[PDB]
Structure formats: C-alpha cells, structure tokens
Amino acid sequence: VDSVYRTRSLGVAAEGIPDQYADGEAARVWQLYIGDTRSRTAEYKAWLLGLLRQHGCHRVLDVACGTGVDSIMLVEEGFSVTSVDASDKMLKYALKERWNRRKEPAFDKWVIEEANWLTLDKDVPAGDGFDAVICLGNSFAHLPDSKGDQSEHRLALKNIASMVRPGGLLVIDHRNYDYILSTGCAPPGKNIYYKSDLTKDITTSVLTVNNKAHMVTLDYTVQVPGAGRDGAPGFSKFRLSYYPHCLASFTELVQEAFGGRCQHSVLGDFKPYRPGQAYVPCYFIHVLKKTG
Amino acid sequence: VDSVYRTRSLGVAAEGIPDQYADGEAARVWQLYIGDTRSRTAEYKAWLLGLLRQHGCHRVLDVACGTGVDSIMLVEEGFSVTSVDASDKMLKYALKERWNRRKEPAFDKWVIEEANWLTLDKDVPAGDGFDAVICLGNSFAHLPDSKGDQSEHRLALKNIASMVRPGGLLVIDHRNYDYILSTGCAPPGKNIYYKSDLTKDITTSVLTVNNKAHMVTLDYTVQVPGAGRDGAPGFSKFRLSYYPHCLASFTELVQEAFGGRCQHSVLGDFKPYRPGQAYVPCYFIHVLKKTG
C-alpha cells in the first residue's frame, strides 16, 4: 500500500514560514496581473459615476471588492461604500489601502468585510438595503457550476439582489462568452475597465461537457519586464477559469433573481445594446432597477 | 501518457470565490486551535513585562507576530512595537485586531508588517536596532532544514540578531525537544504561555534521517464542542511539523549569530535552568544580551 505524508495539512499556517503556495512562480506572475489592472479607464469612470449620480445613489455595496479598485473610486467620490469579497488573498490589498489612507475621514468610514454570495444574506447586514449594488469586472463568472444545474448560480444572484433596496440598482456584468464560445478565442489586452500596461498571450480552452459549455479556462503567459539577462523580459504563466454565461441565459437568471419585479437593460460595452448590431462588445453590463 | 488539469493555478485567487484551502476540514479545526490559544497566562505576562522593564526596553520587535497576542499585550503596555510575520493567513488576525482598536492612540501607532527571517534585514529598517527582539511560542522551530546543513537556520538567526541594538535583548525559545526525542512523546495541552480551553490528543512522529532527528510532526485531534448529535462533540484533526532543536546545539547556534559578543542565559520554563535539575521544563527560553 502506498501512502502520502505531508509536513503540514492543506490550509493551516505557521508563524515564520510563508503560506502554502504564496511564492510559486504562478502566484508571483499573478501578483503582477492583479496589479497591472488598476489603470482605470476614463470611459469606465465617467459611466459608473454618471449612472450613480443620475439615480441619486449613495450607500453602495461592492460585492466583488477584489483589491478594492472600484471601491476606492467610489470612496473618494463621497459615496458611503461597504466592500466585501470572499477571497482573503485579494482582500488583503484593500485593507492595506484603507489603513494607509485611514487618516482621511472618507477612508475611515469605508467598510471592508468578508462575505460569500452563497451566504451573502447572512454575512452582510442589508438593513433596508442599498442604493446601488455592484459586481463588475466579469467577477460573477468565477463561480463555477458544481451541481450541474445552475442552482448555486441562482442562489448567489438571489442573495445579491437581496441587498438592493426597493427603487435601488444592481449593476452586474459578464464577458462576451457568446463570441468566445463561437471563436474559441478570448482576445487579450481587450479591456474596457482598466488599461493594461502588461503584455500577455492568451490560450483559451473550452470544456464542453456532454454538449453544453461548462467552463472556459484561460492560460495567461505574462511577459514580466526585467527577468532576463541584458534587460530582456521573462515569461511566466498562470491560469484561471470561468463559467461561459450567455447573454440570453444570464438575462433569464438575473431577472429571475428579482422575481420579475425589476427593470432590465443590457449595455454593449458602455453604449446601449441592440441585437443585430455590427459592434460586438467584450463585456455585457446589466443594470437592473428594483421595481418592487 | 497521462495529464492533469486544474481550474486555476496553485496560489492564485479570484474575486467571488474563497481562496484555495480556506474551508477544508483541517483549516476549520486549525482556526479553532489558534483561536483557543490566546488566554495569556499571568506567569508569562509578569515574566515578559518584568524582563523588558528591568532592562528598560521601549522599542520592541516581534518577529513571530502570528495573530498578535504577544504584541497586543506589549502595545497595550506602552511599548513601541512593530510586528512582523511571514504568514498572511495569520497576520490577517493581528491586522483586524488593530483596526477594531485603531481609535486608541497606542493601537494607532502599532506597526504590523510582512517579513521573512531569511531576508529580515531587507524587509525591516532596524536603523540602529530595537531594544528587544522577541520570538516566543516555539516559533523558530517552524523553519525546516531543507538543505541538510542548517544553513537556513543560521541565516535566519543571523538576520534576527542584527535587528538587536547593542546592549539590547533577543528573547527566543524552543520546546524541550531533548525530552520529546527521548520519549517520542510531546505531552498535549501542556503550555506555559497560554491556557488552552480546548481538548486535544497528540500523536508524535519523529523522522530521523540517517541518524539525526530531522523533524517532529504532530497530528492534533481536536474535540470540537458541538459538532455531534445531542450536544456531543465532533472530532477533527490537523498536522504541523517542527525542527527538533536540542538545547546543546541551539545554544551554539544562537551565540554563533552574535559572533560570540553576547550574554547568554537559558531559562527553564520561566525559572532559571541548571543541568541535572529535577524539574523538566516544557520550554527553553533563551535571553541573549548583545554586548556589541
């Protein structure tokens, strides 16, 4: 009989030694990635703020906090933001940010907490709800579908809709998987939210279970600036997976999470969307208003 | 030929989802363990505080920060303490605590940074060195010996000593491995630093490479209070390894770090220590006064 014997269990920590895979070549390059995506776009900044002001929103919940890029922007712009994420590895960066600028009143009232979409309703006190709830950056696409049916999906979206106060808003997006699925290719460097200063190639792998798109895996070969000899760069790789959400299905889901009592409109990239339009967007943004 | 596919690389994180092994059975029991190892003991508090004031120490550096328990106590007692650890999963606990109390002037001036003994000199600006440097809780034991020759142990101990200003202190301990090694057993719940409210069983495994104890692994079976049926307690386990440091060798190692210019004193559990003495200590605390 063969047996495996590890130093410490998967998941535990120990004073003095880095956590399990903190220094892998992958975690390394990944830090370059989540870093490189900070250079917020003008089109993006003007669009979100306008939408929010146009609706008189004020207290907003960011359910895909990440390193806190979209939240810091709402914070500096006077909104009363409460940010939550399920990933502690990414949450650590927002927390660092808050602490640095903690001397600023606006940053001292910024609430960052850990929450999970699947249990959101019990992790974050909605109270009367929020004005705008936001889930941008194709972040919902991370939640895989383990049970076959999209039960987990429906659960997260329902909870997410839960934090939206009546007459309130929900701004959630997804990448254009309708196009990725038909091309088999997900163009890199193609972003609308943040300008990428890093260079990368992207290998798109699509897993089709019996006959239904089940997952899209992306392999990022990032060119790291000065990891070569006479200045030349190096090439490290890392991988991430997403659930290929189609405009039609997602549209059914998000609406069904509101029980039908909602206002739905899907934007192309940042401009309106009408099926049949020559323009194929990289992102599909959904802005739902809670009418009941 | 075979091949294996992962959803995402080992070490990367994604917004809507929990980090890699954050919710494993072992990680869940482990959180309990570290959360039920904070009830500080009076002997410790008095001993530590006394030794520090007796030497008129004010700037203290905690290199085995952990959840901050040792440091919180020092910050609470007016000391100028900067805390570092190489484990984010743990550092996360001290950061949180600092925020919740960021309104108390003392807790506002508490520096919690990330650092590695191996590169301690590069991560922390000692300037002229700290008054005291502490590494309690048998935390040094965590650094394993990967090269065979305790090079890393030496490097770690060198950097650590260098943070000590002349006339300054260095308090560093390790468990009584001599006793463990000869008994093959490391008694559980037997702590001098904190009082454990948890009930646990411990299986000790000693890996003796050619003929030198090379490692000590402990499998903690914790009896979780209400994970059973009619109130009954559940039973879950986790493991952690340590490098078996013997008093004789660790003593050479620690002095070797100060280049010999130091005053060394090894304490029993908290009382002085003299070979052959009837009382067998659980811990060996080493206090080294840097004489230059």
Q: Which positions of A are catalytic?
A: 21, 137, 142, 175, 194
- Its domain, for residue A203, covers 22-37+176-242
Q: The CATH number of the domain where B233 resides is what?
A: 3.30.46.10
| Sign of the C-alpha dihedral computed for residues A49, A55, A58 and A60 taken in this order | negative
Residue by residue, what is the 3-state secondary structure of A105-141? HHHHCCEEEECCHHHHHHHCCCCCCEEEEEECCCCHH
The distance in angstroms from the start CA to the end CA of chain B is: 62
Distances (CA, A) of A12 to A128, A214, B75, B87, B206: 38, 32, 27, 10, 20
**Both B148 and B193 in a single domain?**
no
Query: In terms of C-beta distances under 8 Å and separation of at least 24 residues, what long-range contacts does A186-192 make, across chains too?
Result: A186/A216, A186/A218, A187/A282, A188/A220, A190/A282, A191/A37, A191/A41, A191/A282, A192/A41, A192/A43, A192/A44, A192/A269, A192/A270, A192/A282, A192/A283
**Is B33 inside a domain boundary?**
yes
Binding annotation of B = 3, 5, 21, 30, 33, 40, 64, 85-87, 116-117, 136-139, 175, 214, 220, 239
Q: Which residue of B has its CA nearest to A157?
A: B16
Residue B289: both structure tokens together = 């006064």
CA distance B119 to A185: 43
Residues 6+ apart with CB under 8 A from A180: A186, A204, A206, A216, A244
**Both A152 and A185 in a single domain?**
no
User: What is the structure's resolution, reported in angstroms to one decimal?
Assistant: 2.5
**Both B167 and B43 in a single domain?**
yes
Q: Which residues of A touch B19 (CB under 8 A)?
A: 87-89
C-alpha torsion angle, residues A171, A174, A176, A178 (rounded to 10): -110
Q: Which of B137, B168, B245, B283 is catalytic?
A: B137
Contact A144 B238 (CB under 8 A): no
Determination technique for this PDB entry? X-ray
Q: Pick left, alpha or beta for residue A68 (phi over 0 → left; psi -120 to 50 → alpha; otherwise beta).
A: left
**Both B120 and B255 in a single domain?**
yes
Query: How close, in Å, is residue B159 to chain A by CA atoms?
Result: 13
CA distance A204 to A187: 9
DSSP code for B229: S
**Both B221 and B152 in a single domain?**
no
**Both A50 and A150 in a single domain?**
yes
CA distance B284 to B179: 11
**Both A76 and A165 in a single domain?**
yes
Q: Which of B175, B242, B283, B286 is catalytic?
A: B175
By the 10 Å C-beta count (0-12 exposed, 13-18 middle, 19+ buried), A125 is classed as: exposed
- Contact status, residue B246 vs residue B206, Cβ threshold 8 Å: no
**Both B170 and B275 in a single domain?**
yes
**Is B5 inside a domain boundary?**
no
Query: How close, in Å, is residue B228 to chain A by CA atoms?
Result: 23
Q: The CATH number of the domain where A90 resides is what?
A: 3.40.50.150
**Both B151 and B266 in a single domain?**
yes
Query: How close, in Å, is residue B84 to chain A by CA atoms?
Result: 9
Residue A161: both structure tokens together = 């809709």
**Count: domains in chain A:** 2
